[PDB]
Design a protein around this ligand. Structure first.
Ligand SMILES: *[C@@H]1O[C@H](CO)[C@@H](O)[C@H](O)[C@H]1NC(C)=O
Lengths: 47, 48
């Protein structure tokens, strides 16, 4: 309903090439009242 | 070939209504994205 909601988590790990065998619940970071349609997204990396 | 602008004359001698007034219009839009601006939500004291 026009809100864009972000939830997130940090954990430490020690692994080479996969997502870990564990359960962790993401806390909400922030809710943004942005009001805009989203249909596609992209990510930004350090070069 | 008249100029579409005229420079205002506001001398402190002039009468009320001939004088310059500062104006602001407050406008808004509703019911299409969430309300980012709102009046102050007052709070009472807390009883226990
Ligand atoms: C968002 O997209 C929908 C579907 O195309 C459209 O009906 C709506 O008007 C759009 N809203 C805005 C704010 O562009």
């Amino acid at each position: 309903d026009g809100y864009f909601k972000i939830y997130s988590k940090h954990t430490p790990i020690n692994l080479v090439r996969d997502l870990p065998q564990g359960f962790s619940a993401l806390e909400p970071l922030v809710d943004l009242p942005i009001g805009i349609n989203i249909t596609r997204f992209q990510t930004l990396l350090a070069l | 070939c008249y100029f579409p602008l005229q420079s205002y004359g506001f001398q402190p001698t002039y009468g009320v209504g001939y004088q310059p007034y500062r104006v602001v219009v407050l406008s808004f839009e509703l019911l299409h994205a969430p309300a980012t601006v709102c009046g102050p939500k007052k709070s009472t004291n807390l009883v226990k």
